Design a protein around this ligand. Structure first.
Ligand SMILES: [Zn+2]
Ligand SMILES: [Zn+2]
Lengths: 19, 149
């Protein structure tokens, strides 16, 4: 489930910078 | 299509310079200043993504098992699979570009440097084709630079 692991990582990075 | 041209210019230069260590001295072109700041944002954030997630990225690279030209196809389809999802944000975009640079480094080591520019175009094609509306609304690469200030 590679796709879902990359998406999950990108959403994490987005949340960090949105703060 | 100025958005596509600028996107390709940014993504292609980052992937090539990450893979070779050589910086491309040629002039940018239209909207050159925003591209240079995008590329600087990309080196800062993207290098960090690669360092802080090297283990995950290498496991992903391992899955793709890229030893020849035909393997290179699988890489674009991963891009398509993600961008075909409805969610859009800059974290996804910078993360996929950063994984592209990680795979570009590999391609260089495997004597497939000529594959890096096609990889960059495939990333750019999918990004712009599938997310043009969202990108437009962020003010393209200006939004990218400001999001990652
Ligand atoms: Zn991180
Ligand atoms: Zn190739």
């Amino acid at each position: 489930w590679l796709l879902q692991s990359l998406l999950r990582l990108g959403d994490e990075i987005n949340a960090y910078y949105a703060r | 299509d100025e958005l596509y041209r600028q996107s390709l210019e940014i993504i292609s230069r980052y992937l090539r310079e990450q893979a070779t260590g050589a910086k491309d001295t040629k002039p940018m072109g239209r909207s050159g200043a925003t591209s240079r700041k995008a590329l600087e944002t990309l080196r800062r954030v993207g290098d960090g993504v690669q360092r802080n997630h090297e283990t995950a990225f290498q496991g992903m690279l391992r899955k793709l098992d890229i030893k020849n030209e035909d393997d290179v196809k699988s890489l674009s389809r991963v891009m398509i699979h993600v961008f075909s999802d409805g969610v859009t944000n800059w974290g996804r975009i910078v993360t996929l570009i950063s994984f592209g640079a990680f795979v570009a480094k590999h391609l260089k080591t495997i004597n497939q440097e000529s594959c890096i520019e096609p990889l960059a175009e495939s990333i750019t094609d999918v990004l712009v084709r599938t997310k043009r509306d969202w990108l437009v609304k962020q003010r393209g690469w200006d939004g990218f630079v400001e999001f990652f200030h």
